[PDB]
Structure formats: C-alpha cells, structure tokens
Subunit: 122 residues, 2 copies
Amino acid sequence: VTELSDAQKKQLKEQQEMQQMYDMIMQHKRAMQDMQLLWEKAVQQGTWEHQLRRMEMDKTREWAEQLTKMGIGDFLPPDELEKFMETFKALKEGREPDYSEYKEFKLTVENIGYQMLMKMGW
Amino acid sequence: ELSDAQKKQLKEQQEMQQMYDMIMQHKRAMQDMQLLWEKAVQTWEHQLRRMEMDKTREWAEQLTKMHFIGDFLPPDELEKFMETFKALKEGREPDYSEYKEFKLTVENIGYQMLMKMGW
C-alpha cells in the first residue's frame, strides 16, 4: 500500500496487527484440533501417544515463537516468568519438559495470546 | 424508535461490553491477590492462596451462568476440569498444579467467549 499519510500508516498497521493476532490464534486452535483427532483415531487402534505428544509440543513451541515476534514479562509475575522461560528453553533445545509443566506452559501461551488480542481491541 | 437491526447491534454491543468488564474486573482481582500474596512472602500466604482459589471458583461459576463448557474442552480435559471445579466447590484443596491448570483453563474460556462476541 503506497503513499499513505502517517495517520494512515498507523491505523493500517494496527488493523493488520490485530488481524494477524486473530489469525494466528485460529491457526493454533486449528492445529490443536487436528492433533486431537489424530489421537482419537490412534487410540481407536503407547509409542504413538508419545509421538503425538512431541509433535504437539513442537507446535506449541512454534506458536510461542510467533507470539514473541508479535510483541511479556508484562504478563507474568516473577516466578511464573522464570518457569515459562525455562520450559520455553527446553522445548527450543528439543528436550521434553515434565508433562504438567508443559501443560501449564501451553495454557499460559494461549492465555497470553488472548490478552494480546484483547489489548489490541479495547 | 430503533429498528430491529439497530436493537440487535445495541444488544450485541452491550453483551460484549458486559463480558469485557467482567473479564477485566476478574483480572484485576487476581492482580490484587497476587500482589498481596507476594508480600506475604516478604500461614498467611497460604490463606491468601485459598481466597484466590475461591475467587477463581466464583469466576468459573459466573462464566457458567452464561453443556456450554464442554464446548471448549475435549472430553478428557472436561473431566479433570469438573473434578477440580467440584473439589473447589466442596472446599477441598487440589494439587496446586491441578489448580493452576484449572485457573488458566477457566480464564482462556472467558477470553474465548469474549472472542466469539467480538469476531
């Protein structure tokens, strides 16, 4: 989009940024649903559940990477931040965190995603 | 005299703004409990933690008043969610990692219903 005023560049970047935050949240929701059905069908048949788990963990790490580039200490109190970053680190290094902390990290990532969308609206 | 289409806009706008308000007020109440709990950490810290769980439990009852929660969780996640919810209702104290995940799940459900209204 060429020849915008400064006013126009500001409105448009906000619109597109809200829209991308939204689309990414729906993408992450889509991919999680797909992982879900994959597991519902594998159980309709042990080593599979751990494979699906690792695939899911990598998609969650990706979505967290996307969120970082969209913006977070602003969202977490000190103790939660250290744990969040630790788990993020293990996922990045390809290690497998404790399942309960992975679940906590995943919910936290989705939680921050929503808070960001909410700050862009409103 | 508003038209039918205009009443619908007005009603949708109010329900959204009412949903936005309740989320913001719950968030601020969680921020207060977090701040008070941090200063209990330089028991009382445990007592502030228990009231926080109660405020989460109240928030979850509030959202439910608006069947409709199994819309957000696959049936496995649904079961754990209701066990923790029922533990809280009955005055039991769950595993703290069981509570944290219920807290975050409750919150993400609130964000999702706001999101449905707004998009």
